[PDB]
Short mmCIF file of all heavy atoms in Angstrom, two decimals:
data_model
loop_
_atom_site.label_atom_id
_atom_site.label_comp_id
_atom_site.label_asym_id
_atom_site.label_seq_id
_atom_site.Cartn_x
_atom_site.Cartn_y
_atom_site.Cartn_z
N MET A 1 -17.05 18.67 53.21
CA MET A 1 -15.75 19.18 52.84
C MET A 1 -14.87 18.00 52.46
O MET A 1 -14.96 16.91 53.04
CB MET A 1 -15.13 19.94 53.99
CG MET A 1 -13.68 20.37 53.79
SD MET A 1 -13.08 21.34 55.20
CE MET A 1 -14.04 22.82 55.03
N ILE A 2 -14.01 18.22 51.46
CA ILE A 2 -13.06 17.20 51.03
C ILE A 2 -11.63 17.69 51.27
O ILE A 2 -11.24 18.73 50.75
CB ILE A 2 -13.24 16.87 49.57
CG1 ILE A 2 -14.70 16.55 49.26
CG2 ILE A 2 -12.37 15.71 49.18
CD1 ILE A 2 -15.00 16.18 47.82
N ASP A 3 -10.85 16.93 52.01
CA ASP A 3 -9.44 17.22 52.21
C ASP A 3 -8.63 16.63 51.06
O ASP A 3 -8.73 15.42 50.79
CB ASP A 3 -9.00 16.64 53.54
CG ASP A 3 -7.56 16.96 53.93
OD1 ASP A 3 -6.82 17.65 53.18
OD2 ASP A 3 -7.17 16.51 55.02
N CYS A 4 -7.87 17.48 50.37
CA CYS A 4 -7.02 17.07 49.26
C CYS A 4 -5.76 16.41 49.77
O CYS A 4 -5.05 15.78 48.99
CB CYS A 4 -6.60 18.27 48.43
SG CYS A 4 -7.98 19.04 47.59
N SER A 5 -5.47 16.58 51.05
CA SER A 5 -4.23 16.12 51.62
C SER A 5 -4.37 14.84 52.47
O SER A 5 -5.32 14.08 52.29
CB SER A 5 -3.61 17.27 52.43
OG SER A 5 -2.22 17.09 52.53
N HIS A 6 -3.42 14.60 53.36
CA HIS A 6 -3.41 13.46 54.26
C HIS A 6 -3.71 12.14 53.54
O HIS A 6 -3.10 11.88 52.51
CB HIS A 6 -4.31 13.75 55.47
CG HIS A 6 -3.94 15.02 56.17
ND1 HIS A 6 -4.67 16.19 56.02
CD2 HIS A 6 -2.88 15.34 56.94
CE1 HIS A 6 -4.10 17.15 56.72
NE2 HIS A 6 -3.02 16.67 57.29
N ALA A 7 -4.64 11.32 54.04
CA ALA A 7 -4.87 10.01 53.40
C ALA A 7 -5.50 10.12 52.00
O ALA A 7 -5.45 9.17 51.24
CB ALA A 7 -5.68 9.10 54.32
N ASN A 8 -6.07 11.27 51.65
CA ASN A 8 -6.64 11.42 50.31
C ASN A 8 -5.61 11.61 49.23
O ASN A 8 -5.85 11.25 48.09
CB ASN A 8 -7.70 12.52 50.24
CG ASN A 8 -9.09 12.01 50.56
OD1 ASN A 8 -9.36 10.81 50.47
ND2 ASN A 8 -9.98 12.90 50.94
N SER A 9 -4.47 12.19 49.60
CA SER A 9 -3.33 12.36 48.69
C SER A 9 -2.32 11.23 48.88
O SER A 9 -1.23 11.29 48.32
CB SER A 9 -2.64 13.68 49.00
OG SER A 9 -1.97 13.60 50.25
N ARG A 10 -2.67 10.24 49.70
CA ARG A 10 -1.77 9.17 50.19
C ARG A 10 -0.47 9.70 50.82
O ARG A 10 0.61 9.13 50.63
CB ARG A 10 -1.48 8.15 49.07
CG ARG A 10 -2.75 7.60 48.40
CD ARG A 10 -2.43 6.73 47.18
NE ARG A 10 -3.61 6.54 46.32
CZ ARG A 10 -4.46 5.51 46.36
NH1 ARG A 10 -4.30 4.50 47.23
NH2 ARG A 10 -5.48 5.48 45.51
N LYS A 11 -0.58 10.79 51.57
CA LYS A 11 0.58 11.40 52.22
C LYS A 11 1.63 11.93 51.21
O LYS A 11 2.81 12.09 51.54
CB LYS A 11 1.22 10.41 53.20
N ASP A 12 1.18 12.23 50.00
CA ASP A 12 2.06 12.68 48.92
C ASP A 12 1.52 14.01 48.44
O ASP A 12 0.47 14.08 47.82
CB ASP A 12 2.05 11.67 47.79
CG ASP A 12 2.84 12.14 46.56
OD1 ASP A 12 3.51 13.20 46.59
OD2 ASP A 12 2.77 11.42 45.56
N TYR A 13 2.25 15.09 48.74
CA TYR A 13 1.74 16.43 48.51
C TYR A 13 1.55 16.72 47.02
O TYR A 13 0.76 17.59 46.66
CB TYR A 13 2.65 17.46 49.16
CG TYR A 13 3.95 17.70 48.43
CD1 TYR A 13 4.02 18.64 47.41
CD2 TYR A 13 5.10 16.96 48.75
CE1 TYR A 13 5.21 18.86 46.74
CE2 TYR A 13 6.28 17.18 48.09
CZ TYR A 13 6.32 18.12 47.09
OH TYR A 13 7.48 18.34 46.41
N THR A 14 2.25 16.00 46.16
CA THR A 14 2.10 16.20 44.70
C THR A 14 0.81 15.59 44.16
O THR A 14 0.47 15.82 43.01
CB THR A 14 3.27 15.58 43.91
OG1 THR A 14 3.20 14.15 44.00
CG2 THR A 14 4.63 16.09 44.46
N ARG A 15 0.08 14.82 44.97
CA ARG A 15 -1.25 14.32 44.58
C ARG A 15 -2.40 15.25 44.99
O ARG A 15 -3.53 15.07 44.54
CB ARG A 15 -1.46 12.89 45.08
CG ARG A 15 -0.50 11.92 44.40
CD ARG A 15 -0.57 10.50 44.95
NE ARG A 15 -1.75 9.77 44.48
CZ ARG A 15 -1.87 9.18 43.29
NH1 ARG A 15 -0.87 9.19 42.39
NH2 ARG A 15 -3.00 8.54 42.99
N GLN A 16 -2.13 16.26 45.81
CA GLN A 16 -3.18 17.20 46.20
C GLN A 16 -3.81 17.85 44.99
O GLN A 16 -5.01 18.09 44.99
CB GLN A 16 -2.65 18.29 47.12
CG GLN A 16 -2.33 17.81 48.51
CD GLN A 16 -2.06 18.97 49.46
OE1 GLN A 16 -2.98 19.69 49.85
NE2 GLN A 16 -0.82 19.13 49.85
N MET A 17 -3.01 18.17 43.99
CA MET A 17 -3.53 18.75 42.75
C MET A 17 -4.45 17.78 42.00
O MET A 17 -5.44 18.20 41.44
CB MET A 17 -2.38 19.18 41.83
CG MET A 17 -2.82 20.01 40.63
SD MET A 17 -3.53 21.60 41.09
CE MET A 17 -2.00 22.44 41.52
N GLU A 18 -4.14 16.50 42.00
CA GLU A 18 -5.01 15.50 41.35
C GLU A 18 -6.33 15.36 42.09
O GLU A 18 -7.38 15.17 41.48
CB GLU A 18 -4.36 14.11 41.36
CG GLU A 18 -2.98 14.04 40.75
CD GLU A 18 -2.41 12.64 40.84
OE1 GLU A 18 -3.00 11.78 41.56
OE2 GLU A 18 -1.36 12.41 40.20
N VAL A 19 -6.28 15.41 43.41
CA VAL A 19 -7.53 15.40 44.16
C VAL A 19 -8.33 16.65 43.80
O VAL A 19 -9.52 16.55 43.48
CB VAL A 19 -7.29 15.32 45.66
CG1 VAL A 19 -8.62 15.31 46.42
CG2 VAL A 19 -6.47 14.08 46.00
N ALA A 20 -7.68 17.81 43.79
CA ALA A 20 -8.37 19.05 43.44
C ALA A 20 -8.96 18.99 42.03
O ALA A 20 -10.07 19.48 41.80
CB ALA A 20 -7.44 20.24 43.55
N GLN A 21 -8.22 18.39 41.10
CA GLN A 21 -8.71 18.20 39.73
C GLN A 21 -9.95 17.33 39.71
O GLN A 21 -10.89 17.61 38.97
CB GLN A 21 -7.61 17.59 38.84
CG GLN A 21 -6.55 18.60 38.44
CD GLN A 21 -5.25 17.97 37.95
OE1 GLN A 21 -5.07 16.75 37.99
NE2 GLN A 21 -4.34 18.81 37.49
N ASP A 22 -9.96 16.27 40.52
CA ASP A 22 -11.12 15.43 40.59
C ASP A 22 -12.30 16.22 41.17
O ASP A 22 -13.41 16.13 40.69
CB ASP A 22 -10.85 14.20 41.43
CG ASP A 22 -11.91 13.16 41.27
OD1 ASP A 22 -11.80 12.38 40.33
OD2 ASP A 22 -12.89 13.17 42.03
N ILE A 23 -12.03 17.01 42.20
CA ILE A 23 -13.09 17.82 42.77
C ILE A 23 -13.62 18.81 41.74
O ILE A 23 -14.84 18.98 41.61
CB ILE A 23 -12.60 18.54 44.03
CG1 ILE A 23 -12.31 17.51 45.12
CG2 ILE A 23 -13.64 19.55 44.52
CD1 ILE A 23 -11.47 18.02 46.26
N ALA A 24 -12.72 19.44 40.98
CA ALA A 24 -13.14 20.39 39.97
C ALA A 24 -14.08 19.70 38.98
O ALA A 24 -15.13 20.24 38.65
CB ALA A 24 -11.95 20.98 39.25
N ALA A 25 -13.70 18.51 38.55
CA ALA A 25 -14.52 17.77 37.60
C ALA A 25 -15.90 17.51 38.20
O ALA A 25 -16.90 17.64 37.50
CB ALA A 25 -13.83 16.49 37.15
N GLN A 26 -15.98 17.21 39.49
CA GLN A 26 -17.29 17.00 40.12
C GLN A 26 -18.13 18.28 40.14
O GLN A 26 -19.32 18.25 39.84
CB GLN A 26 -17.13 16.49 41.54
CG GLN A 26 -16.46 15.14 41.66
CD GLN A 26 -16.29 14.74 43.11
OE1 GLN A 26 -17.28 14.67 43.86
NE2 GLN A 26 -15.06 14.48 43.53
N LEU A 27 -17.50 19.39 40.51
CA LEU A 27 -18.19 20.67 40.58
C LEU A 27 -18.72 21.06 39.20
O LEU A 27 -19.80 21.64 39.09
CB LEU A 27 -17.27 21.78 41.10
CG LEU A 27 -16.79 21.61 42.55
CD1 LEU A 27 -15.67 22.58 42.85
CD2 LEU A 27 -17.92 21.79 43.55
N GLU A 28 -17.97 20.72 38.17
CA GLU A 28 -18.39 21.00 36.79
C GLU A 28 -19.58 20.16 36.35
O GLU A 28 -20.40 20.64 35.58
CB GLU A 28 -17.24 20.75 35.82
CG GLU A 28 -16.14 21.78 35.88
CD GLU A 28 -15.04 21.44 34.90
OE1 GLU A 28 -15.14 21.89 33.75
OE2 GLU A 28 -14.10 20.69 35.27
N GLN A 29 -19.64 18.91 36.80
CA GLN A 29 -20.69 17.97 36.40
C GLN A 29 -21.94 18.20 37.24
O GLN A 29 -23.05 18.26 36.72
CB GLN A 29 -20.21 16.54 36.59
N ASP A 30 -21.76 18.29 38.55
CA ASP A 30 -22.87 18.43 39.47
C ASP A 30 -22.25 18.94 40.75
O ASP A 30 -22.15 20.16 40.94
CB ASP A 30 -23.59 17.08 39.64
CG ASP A 30 -24.64 17.09 40.76
OD1 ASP A 30 -24.83 18.12 41.45
OD2 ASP A 30 -25.30 16.05 40.96
N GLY A 31 -21.78 18.02 41.60
CA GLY A 31 -21.06 18.38 42.80
C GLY A 31 -21.86 19.16 43.82
O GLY A 31 -21.28 19.88 44.64
#
């Protein structure tokens, strides 16, 4: 499991979407 929040978003809730976008890109490629 990947947490989009906490240290992965650098404690910035507006980066959760960028993490999710990166995850989406992985799921699309392989993931």
Side-chain angles (χ1 to χ4, degrees), residues 1-10 12-28 30-31:
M1 172 177 292
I2 308 181
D3 185 359
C4 294
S5 204
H6 306 104
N8 271 340
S9 71
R10 308 173 197 265
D12 174 6
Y13 75 88
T14 69
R15 295 175 76 80
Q16 288 191 73
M17 190 65 75
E18 305 179 349
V19 180
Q21 284 162 355
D22 193 85
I23 293 163
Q26 296 178 58
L27 296 168
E28 288 179 89
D30 171 359

